[PDB]
A paper describes a structure:
Here we show that ubiquitin associated protein 1 (UBAP1), a subunit of human ESCRT-I, coassembles in a stable 1:1:1:1 complex with Vps23/TSG101, VPS28, and VPS37. The X-ray crystal structure of the C-terminal region of UBAP1 reveals a domain that we describe as a solenoid of overlapping UBAs (SOUBA). NMR analysis shows that each of the three rigidly arranged overlapping UBAs making up the SOUBA interact with ubiquitin. UBAP1's function is exclusively required for degradation of ubiquitinated endosomal cargo but not for other ESCRT-I-mediated processes such as midbody abscission or viral budding.
One of these mutants, with 415-KKGE-418 mutated to AAGA, readily crystallized. The 1.65 Å resolution crystal structure of the UBA-containing C-terminal region from UBAP1 has two molecules in the asymmetric unit that are linked to each other through a disulfide bond. However, multiangle laser light scattering indicates that the molecule is a monomer in solution (data not shown). It appears that the disulfide-linked dimer is formed as the protein oxidizes during the crystallization process. The solenoid arrangement of the three UBAs forms a convex surface containing helices one and three from each UBA. The opposite face forms a concave surface built from the second helix from each UBA. The residues showing the greatest perturbation lie along the convex face of the SOUBA domain and cover an extended hydrophobic surface.
Author numbering:
A (entry chain B): 386 to 500
B (entry chain A): 386 to 499
Write the structure that this text describes.
Amino acid sequence: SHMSPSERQCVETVVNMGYSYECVLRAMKAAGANIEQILDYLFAHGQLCEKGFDPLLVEEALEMHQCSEEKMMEFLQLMSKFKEMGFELKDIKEVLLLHNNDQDNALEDLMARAG
Amino acid sequence: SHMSPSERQCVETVVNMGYSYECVLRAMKAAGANIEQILDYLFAHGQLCEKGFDPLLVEEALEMHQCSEEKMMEFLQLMSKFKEMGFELKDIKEVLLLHNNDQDNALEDLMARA
Ligand SMILES: [K+]
Ligand SMILES: [K+]
Ligand SMILES: [K+]
Ligand SMILES: [K+]
Ligand code: NA
């Protein structure tokens, strides 16, 4: 197998917890071959989708903010807002990262390039 | 320029704090285009190299453990120790990650596969 021994151990254990292979493999690609990190990703991804967030934006938020749930949520909410205004995702990520999720600074930057 | 406006802003600001372009671009690639993130990476990388850690291993530790400075140090120390014992970096990273930096479990794993 192309997988390492630790990768296979993660898949075996998390699939035993009741997750599909596809979900586990995707989560492990994102979160790394550690069981708690995979489960935390799977649970957070599920909870956020259930709240109505776009799964693509959820995935961006989980990648961008691995350390703070509070910052992750702030990033997710503002990314959702700016995306619904019509800005491009690549620009939104960039300005939220530069400005530490400050809504006013991020918007000022996005507008300066809106067209 | 191939860089985004935010990337250019970071380079301009950080080079102004007296860092070389090459150091800033490398740090930005690792840490992302946010000035505090770049400065924190540059400073940590410097401090750990000054303590005598292999810069290649320092870079692996800064990548693996962005959230906990204590976890980052514990990983860096163990990766250095296991490398001295003669194990391969790729294996070492894998077992330290799986076993949450537990030395004995990681070691038993490494010896078992060797
Ligand atoms: K890997
Ligand atoms: K963070
Ligand atoms: K890593
Ligand atoms: K961490
Ligand atoms: Na990100």
